[PDB]
């Protein structure tokens, strides 16, 4: 769900950036309410996420080449499909008669992603799909082997569609360098609700702004709100405004004319107690961007996994059920506490 | 001293506008804890019917299966609940879905080409190019296919766009619509927006008559501040119409001559329906849920 | 891609108002603001939903591996 | 009166990709040192 910025520099159109949307316009409230948002952590609305807000997908392509061992036109023992007489149980659920997978099929690690038969071993083998993230088949392409043609097309490009909903840990940022990880997906009933009846899509903590000094975001908030109400895009090109002609006064006048508070505030009520909050909360429309990185792509757990032959110590590799290294500094720290059994 | 009969004496209801989709009613001399409870129930706890299990047979469209399935779930169905029983999750799929627990909606659309003189309109250039919510055909099954005879399952908003297609593409699916609550998913919330706003209070401390009265009148929406004459003071005609913009406080001539507060007892509720139930039915069920919640705890053994 | 079903913030159905919005801008020759008002979008959250919609699906559809040229 | 976004213009161009000169010349002006550099490898004065 790509969206055109309300607040934008006019050069955005000059480069036709609307052909490739990079974010979405979100109702952002500068509020410290949940208690889970603080400095590097921000809150996303549950009901917003449930409605497809900031939803993304990730496509991965694999090349299954049967020229891996054969070279210089050697006779081939291998061939896409299934060999007669030998057939291990329930493989037909993922692959079609040709040995290639059905485009649209759900696959998990261990499931067969393709099927072939090599004459050298006289057995029907399969190339397994292996990744922590399950996928669906988006595209399967069969490719001619060239090499003076003649030979059957073993070769093949398979595209995986991995659905990626916003997870706790995923980074989100405004166009002002204010990035924060998703601390929690807060429910709309528990979310603070505006006088208008709107609950923010994203919650940014007010303690982020005094150190970063991202006032561009503050003016973006009252500009985005003004443009959403009146239905007009605003120019946010640098040095357009002056010390005499302030944007806070410009969009402030626009906000007052529409029927809202001049200083971009809104009277909000608590989602828990239901009572009106102490003061009016700073709410607006800010263009937010979802960063591509998973929060913990490096998320791992090992009880007792494989070990190297020489050292007989846990082997390196997250996906390989590898061990976490306790280096010299952690050794030093365990000596530090005088905690000899923890070191042992 | 507060009695439940003493509450009946002061508690008042005022209906401003009651449309087929949205109702604007007031709850006078009631606590925040009770008004917020009904609000929370109307959004999260009032059960509604929405598509939950989309079974795809073919999807050659640009719109991914997950996305298309999610869109069908979001489409509100003009289905009255109570007609459906709650589905049990522990027993298997063959026993799980019955004529009393599930409603089936089918979508079977195939796009083709049409000869027309060529910017050219997609309804002219192609046949069945745009897939709408009205294209979800209701299929009644089992023991009861006569209970929904005078009540056909039709989406609340039929002109909702579900998918866009080009010739060669096709969509074939069987959607299983079930009973659920808004707390689980927003697709089950029977209300578009159930919110209350406290009655704005404008405490005029000084008479502020004259030309300053005309200046004070422009600070609030047109139908809020009324002036008798040049004198006879400056009164509040309809404090309910106020937007609470605090525009009057950002002026030195009024910053100390007026106070802006609220009536903590008075609530102005605005309830709009998705299309399944009437806004009154949604509020009534909310009060019935709060009563039932307190009743269930009353006839319950206090363990340990 | 296509117009989202329901407003991300409150949940007001917006998916049936996309084609109707372009008709109010083309045929009726109205401004962006007045067009959204006639569709029944008064909250700024519901206002931005359609106003800010890109509709990349029309660009995406022009690539069809099922029909020649 | 404003510095608005092209909505009607955008959607029409999405359906109808121009058959004349491409829109947004600045985008082609961005890759001008790359294309131009390779163009001068065969085309231009002195072969």
């Amino acid at each position: 769900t790509g969206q055109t910025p309300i607040v934008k520099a006019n050069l955005y159109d000059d480069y036709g950036m609307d052909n490739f949307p990079n974010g979405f316009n979100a109702v952002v409230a500068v509020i410290s309410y949940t208690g889970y948002d603080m400095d590097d952590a921000m809150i996303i609305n549950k009901s917003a996420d449930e409605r497809g807000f900031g939803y993304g997908t990730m496509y991965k392509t694999e090349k299954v080449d049967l020229a891996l061992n054969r070279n210089r036109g050697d006779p081939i023992t291998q061939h896409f499909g299934f060999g007669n007489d030998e057939w291990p149980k329930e493989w037909l659920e993922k692959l079609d008669e040709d040995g290639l997978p059905y485009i649209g099929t759900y696959v998990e690690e261990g499931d067969p992603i393709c099927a072939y038969f090599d004459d050298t071993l006289n057995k029907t083998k399969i190339k397994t799909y292996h990744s922590s993230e399950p996928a669906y088949i988006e595209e399967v392409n069969l490719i001619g082997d060239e090499s003076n043609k003649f030979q059957e097309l073993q070769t093949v490009s398979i595209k995986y569609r991995i659905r990626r909903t916003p997870q706790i840990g995923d980074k989100f940022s405004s166009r002002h360098g204010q990035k924060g990880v998703c601390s929690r997906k807060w429910p709309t009933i528990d979310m603070p609700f505006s006088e208008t009846g709107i609950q923010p899509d994203i919650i940014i903590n007010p303690h982020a702004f005094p150190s970063r000094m991202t006032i561009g975001m503050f003016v973006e908030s009252l500009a985005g709100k003004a443009g959403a109400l009146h239905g007009i895009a605003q120019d946010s090109t640098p040095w357009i405004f002056n010390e005499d002609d302030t944007p806070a006064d410009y969009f402030g006048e626009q906000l007052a004319k529409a029927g809202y508070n001049y200083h971009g505030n809104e009277p909000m009520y608590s989602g828990a107690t239901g009572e009106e909050l102490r003061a009016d909360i700073y709410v607006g429309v800010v263009y937010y961007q979802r960063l591509r990185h998973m929060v913990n792509d490096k998320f791992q757990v090992r009880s007792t996994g494989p070990v190297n032959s020489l050292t007989m110590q846990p082997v390196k590799g997250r996906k390989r059920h590898g061990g976490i290294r306790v280096g010299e500094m952690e050794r030093d720290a365990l000596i530090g506490h005088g905690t000899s059994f923890l070191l042992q | 001293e507060w009695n439940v009969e003493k509450f009946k004496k002061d508690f008042e209801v005022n209906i401003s506008s009651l449309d087929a989709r949205e109702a604007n009613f007031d709850l006078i001399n009631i606590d925040t804890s009770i008004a917020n409870a009904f609000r929370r129930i109307m959004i999260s706890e009032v059960p509604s019917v929405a598509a939950e299990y989309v079974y795809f047979f073919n999807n050659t469209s640009v719109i991914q299966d997950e996305v298309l399935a999610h869109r069908i779930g979001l489409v509100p169905l003009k289905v009255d609940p109570d007609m459906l029983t709650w589905v049990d999750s522990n027993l298997p799929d063959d026993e799980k879905f019955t004529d009393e627990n599930t409603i089936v909606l089918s979508l079977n659309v195939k796009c083709t080409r049409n000869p027309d003189a060529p910017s050219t309109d997609p309804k002219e250039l192609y046949n069945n190019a745009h897939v709408y919510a009205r294209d979800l055909k209701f299929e009644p099954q089992g023991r009861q296919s006569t209970t929904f005879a005078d009540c056909p399952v039709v989406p609340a908003d039929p002109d909702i766009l579900l998918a866009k297609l080009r010739p060669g593409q096709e969509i074939s699916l069987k959607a299983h619509c079930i009973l659920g609550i808004g707390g689980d998913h927003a697709k089950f919330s029977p209300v578009s927006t159930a919110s209350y706003r406290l009655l704005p209070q404008i405490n005029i401390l000084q008479p502020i008559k004259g030309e300053s009265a005309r200046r004070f009148q422009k600070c609030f929406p047109p139908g809020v501040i009324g002036i008798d004459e040049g004198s006879d003071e400056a009164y509040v005609k309809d404090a309910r119409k106020d937007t609470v913009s605090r525009e009057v406080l950002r002026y030195e001539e009024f910053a100390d001559k007026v106070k802006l507060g609220r009536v903590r007892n008075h609530f102005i509720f605005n309830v709009e329906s998705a299309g399944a139930m009437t806004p009154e039915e949604i509020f009534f069920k909310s009060v019935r849920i709060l009563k039932n919640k307190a009743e269930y705890l009353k006839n319950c053994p206090i363990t340990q | 891609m296509i117009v989202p079903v329901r407003c991300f913030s409150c949940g007001k159905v917006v998916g049936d108002k996309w084609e109707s919005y372009l008709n109010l801008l083309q045929e009726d020759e109205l401004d962006e603001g007045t067009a959204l008002s006639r569709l029944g979008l008064k909250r700024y959250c519901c206002r931005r939903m359609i106003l800010t919609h890109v509709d990349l699906i029309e660009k995406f559809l022009r690539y069809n591996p099922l029909e020649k040229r | 009166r404003t510095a608005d976004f092209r909505t009607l213009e955008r959607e029409s161009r999405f359906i109808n990709p121009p058959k004349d000169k491409s829109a947004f010349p600045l985008l082609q002006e961005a890759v001008q040192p790359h294309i131009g550099s390779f163009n001068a490898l065969t085309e231009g004065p002195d072969g």
Partner: peptide
């Protein structure tokens, strides 16, 4: 230096919950 041009004919487009654009 020329000031940023204000937008032509800006009206009220936000009112109370049960109140429409009836008041001009």
């Amino acid at each position: 230096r020329k000031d940023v041009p204000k937008v032509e004919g800006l009206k009220l487009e936000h009112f109370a919950t049960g109140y429409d654009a009836e008041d001009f």
